[PDB]
Write a protein that binds this DNA or RNA. Sequence first.
RNA 1: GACGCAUAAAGAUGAGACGCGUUUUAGAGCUAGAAAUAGCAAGUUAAAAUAAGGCUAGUCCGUUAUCAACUUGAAAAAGUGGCACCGAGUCGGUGCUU
DNA 2: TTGTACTGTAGCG
DNA 3: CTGACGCGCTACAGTACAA
DNA 4: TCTCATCTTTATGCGTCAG
Length: 1341
Amino acid sequence: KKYSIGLDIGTNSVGWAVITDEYKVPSKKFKVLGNTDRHSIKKNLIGALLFDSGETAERTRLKRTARRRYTRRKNRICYLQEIFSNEMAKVDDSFFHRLEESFLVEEDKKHERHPIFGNIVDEVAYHEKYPTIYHLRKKLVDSTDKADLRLIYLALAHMIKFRGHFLIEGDLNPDNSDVDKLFIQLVQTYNQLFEENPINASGVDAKAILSARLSKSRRLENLIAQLPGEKKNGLFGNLIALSLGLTPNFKSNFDLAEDAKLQLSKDTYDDDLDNLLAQIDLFLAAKNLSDAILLSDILRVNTEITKAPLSASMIKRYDEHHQDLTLLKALVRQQLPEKYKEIFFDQSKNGYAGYIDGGASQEEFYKFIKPILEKMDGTEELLVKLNREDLLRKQRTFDNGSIPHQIHLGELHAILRRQEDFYPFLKDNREKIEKILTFRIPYYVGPLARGNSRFAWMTRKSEETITPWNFEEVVDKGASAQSFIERMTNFDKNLPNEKVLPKHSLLYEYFTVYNELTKVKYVTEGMRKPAFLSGEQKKAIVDLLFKTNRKVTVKQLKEDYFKKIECFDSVEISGVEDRFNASLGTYHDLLKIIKDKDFLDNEENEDILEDIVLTLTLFEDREMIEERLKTYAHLFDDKVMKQLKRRRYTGWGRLSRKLINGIRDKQSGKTILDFLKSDGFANRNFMQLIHDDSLTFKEDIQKAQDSLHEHIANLAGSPAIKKGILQTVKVVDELVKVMGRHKPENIVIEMARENQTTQKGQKNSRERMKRIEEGIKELGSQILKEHPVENTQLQNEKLYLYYLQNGRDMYVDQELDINRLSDYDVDHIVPQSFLKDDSIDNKVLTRSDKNRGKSDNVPSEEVVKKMKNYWRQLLNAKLITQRKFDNLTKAERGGLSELDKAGFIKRQLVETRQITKHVAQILDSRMNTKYDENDKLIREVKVITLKSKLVSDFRKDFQFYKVREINNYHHAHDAYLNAVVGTALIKKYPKLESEFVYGDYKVIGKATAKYFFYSNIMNFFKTEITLANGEIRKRPLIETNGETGEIVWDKGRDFATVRKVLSMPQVNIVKKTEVQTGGFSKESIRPKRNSDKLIARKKDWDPKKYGGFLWPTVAYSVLVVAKVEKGKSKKLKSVKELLGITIMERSSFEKNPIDFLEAKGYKEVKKDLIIKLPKYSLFELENGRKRMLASAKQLQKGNELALPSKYVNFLYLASHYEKLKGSPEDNEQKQLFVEQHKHYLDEIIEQISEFSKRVILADANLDKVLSAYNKHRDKPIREQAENIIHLFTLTRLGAPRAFKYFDTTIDPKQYRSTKEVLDATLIHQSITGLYETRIDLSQLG
RNA sequence: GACGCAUAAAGAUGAGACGCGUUUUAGAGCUAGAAAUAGCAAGUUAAAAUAAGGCUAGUCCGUUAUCAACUUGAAAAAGUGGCACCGAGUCGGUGCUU
DNA sequence: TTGTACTGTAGCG
DNA sequence: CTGACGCGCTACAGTACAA
DNA sequence: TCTCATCTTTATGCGTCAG
Ligand SMILES: [Mg+2]
Ligand SMILES: [Mg+2]
Ligand SMILES: [Mg+2]
Ligand SMILES: [Mg+2]
């Protein structure tokens, strides 16, 4: 009758088991359908479902954004062509058509094969005149002659297409601020403004500072040594105030007009001209030299004056490349003639031919050519250019991402100013071309859809087509920016219909402070017991402490309120630890801004303050904030309004306005916040107010409050967890269906939750500011003195990484700049392409070009030898962990490898936590569907949430050891053990039922006490318990309920039952058959070839002439029975075979299968015999051999080795020889146990050999492993047992993979033949595998 | 085992952008050559595509999630498979039942 | 002309 | 006042031989 | 790789959810 279900859930597995009250697994004779002879099969009700883990939508989002970027770039080019079309039709009516056709081969082109001029001699003269595009760009910028319109279009199209980044918001004009000689009129302005007439002994410019590094510690000492110092903080020119602004908003030093806060002149210094702009030049020259220093970092130098410094630098790269190539060829020919063919012709050895024609990058070419340059003479300049990474550089390189869009904008504007007189249409629509270059859709607007995209939220004022020129008159940017946030913030849980408050809302901070404060109790010598704080006392302490300090500690509450107001000698306070967790931060911010305490304390103006904070949280754009905030200009002055628009807030709370202050009690008339302010002597907090039946909040919340697929479509989060939730809920539903529609007594779910000690939990959750303090104190820096920081600012990732690295780049020995973090780069040590790991142990803040050069690989050996001392200096200072140092020094150990790819990722842990929590919720909702008028829910099925520690201790205390390498049976065994432990726990201790059942609750540190409680509850399974004093204590062999004589655990029969279940050979292991979805092929495009396997990259692009893709992905295979037109003397020969339907042929095949199969050469196709066969489709062959269909042309192993439990225990104990960490006597018992069954190794080999000879049929590998095992049979038990554990990869279910023994490495035996399964028995397994449909394919065709 | 706050860690979801990379074409190769070729010269750039494509034709969408077999149903979705005992090499045997 | 077996390939910061 | 007992893992491409 | 935002699950500190 009664039964229970245990569940062990993972990211790729769902283990399930059915137990009775006797802890036995039932077995039933299940019906078998199909045309086979077998009509009934015996199966045990225990098993595991295996499936591929669900993928996150990160890669799909990246592909979608790349698609949109390509579409918008093509549209920019189309707009430029639309402007140029009518004028280009005069001079060359087929120019744009030749540019469109330029991909095509000569026989496919409708026009002449030369794109630009349409004839050979003019094209050759063009390429001689302008070797690169940058020569043409510099010619069009600098010269004044009338040029051909085609060349102007080519330069403007190259500028618009590759337009540079938008991380700089200013103008940054390169026409006059590019030059470094602005220092001389800076000191002319210094002489004019500062009325002392100083001597302008002008020395070297910022080139002297840039010679070593752009830093204060170089600049200040350099220009104080060069020109004599009259004022250290008030030198008034080329200062750190004017180049790289200070970290805090500190006042001006030696002010000229007023004392105002100073910062970097990027975007937050515009308001810092209130010294003169608010009271009506050195600051204009400061802006000019800021532009000069920024652009001198971006671009190296221009010696001869020009308005195109980027093109000049690119031409300098071309000229130096030409000179160095000529010199290198001469030196190689003169000194190493045999190496000339390898370097300059053979393009596969990473030479110059491999650097240009081949696929070798710049650093591969440098590391190949560095020894060659070292052995040769006369290579000193080439060596010093290689060390600077400046030798033989290209123009289109990886480090061009540092160029802002303003440089390209300046060069384009220069070209249009040169050519406007000759071409009137350039002057007519110069602003349109500049807008095409400079327009960028705001991130708060999103896609420009018209109601057909599920990603778009933008609303438009009119139904016209959106262009970069009419974007402001069509797109409603305020509503789109509001909907950007309102579509993304969650709703209130208690009131599901309306939105939550901002985190920094004044009402939210008030509610949080009063919720924390209303349960604070104080005691003294006056009275007998601690008493709650009254409403008057709470109001007084809020006014005295919470509105005068941003953070208030309990010590301040002792000595400033109770010592003076209602004077007591000493008071003991409970309800709070050393500091209050709540604070009125927004009140202090608005007191600092508005300078009006009475305005904030006033009651009637509370709503407008709420709307102000809502505006400051929703919006961050200055014009939108001023658009929303101009309503309140009649209360606030203009200066204070300009200051208040700067107060950016980010983050939202969990409660709404209606919950905390909107709804009122029907009898009292008070809101929840009103009750928190004063509730008489009850002093109820938020949960009491929403749970007390006396107040009417409870049923108001109750009045505020289907298919499973719709029950899961509405849950937010990652889509990866929905797969596991679907699988386990379908497994539970099928298990309920198996037992005749009877629900279990209880369902036990293994959760990844834990319990750990109070000091361990607090040590793992300390502030990262403390980490910074002890690390920097240990390594003895003064970085916190120069750049102060609080804990809330380290929540930013880049600032946290800057402080972790002690202000220095950890790939190159140079200092970082705290104010320029937008251009620095956050880098993963182990790259994203290899392993998914976003830990703080895997993250570096480094310079951008060093990260881009260090692509898709571990950082190389040279940087390890350069900065390995600094990595050790940070390592012993506890600033980086040992794992981080191991990742940084990984290239010393061979770099990336297949061993490094193995092991679990922490995303799997987070995913399984999310999964099991949602499974507990959904199973509790589904199973208990009945309720009464007095009983709010009838617990028909008890969802029990066990923790993994209990099952792990049960395995490790009674020798039920688990190893994962042998078979996939451990999931089912874990499910069975979870069910046994959960049912025994709820049977043994009925008073602790509310502790373990979902939805129920029972109501030295608390966590330590709970950890000891959870450790001690497991003792009743044991026969003898060793106490902490080292003295044993006995328990009865038969356990009972205690309150009742009912029997809950017999340490005789039940342990034998559990041993029998764990040794059962038949376990229903099911691999989920899945139709493959995703990308059609591997993304690489291969060159042209005569093969037919190449896939066309476009409809009209024949891959025989244009190349194409390879490795197509088969969605599912299809069994076809038809005739094939085989033979020169053609006959219709009948055949039965699999055909792989790929992903892009999936829709075409499902549209009309007969026509698709007829196009493939088949004919007389049997339509009803078409069988869809997804991946991992299961076939059974002779002697119980099973194969899983990996593809139409490859199979997989499908059998599971049911090794006896004694061998598994021997393998677990033989390995981990001296790391059990139990007791010494236990260790010696397993020592003798493994030594006097050392012969079990031979029996394990015999078992593996028999299983492999029955089902694997890898005979050559079998002889290899037998020879290798015989040749090292004299090694110690440790390494032998460890590699017998490795040895099960040959017999493991799934795809074959290369394992390794002691020293031999066994290559996998691939099953690259699906011919045999065409006459095997096809098995259609249900989600549990109990229901089967066995189809004998030999009877078809 | 849930809620509010504080401090952690490890992760998700959406938008806007950049720089490369790959592929075909353009950038006249010269000489000795019956030649299979050999010597020499040159190399840095540009156009186009960047999932085939789709229709509601948008400066939109197209790699996430769904998916054993059979019977109904456009689809959504619904339905279909006896029990007890003795045993165990991937499940077998024995006995009642319609 | 068709099956096998061994080794290499695979978008990224 | 209320419980005891103190999580993971390869299909196809290219070349070279057996018939 | 950059810039913007919004969440989630676990660990500790405090309070609470009741017959
Ligand atoms: Mg588990
Ligand atoms: Mg990287
Ligand atoms: Mg598992
Ligand atoms: Mg998929």
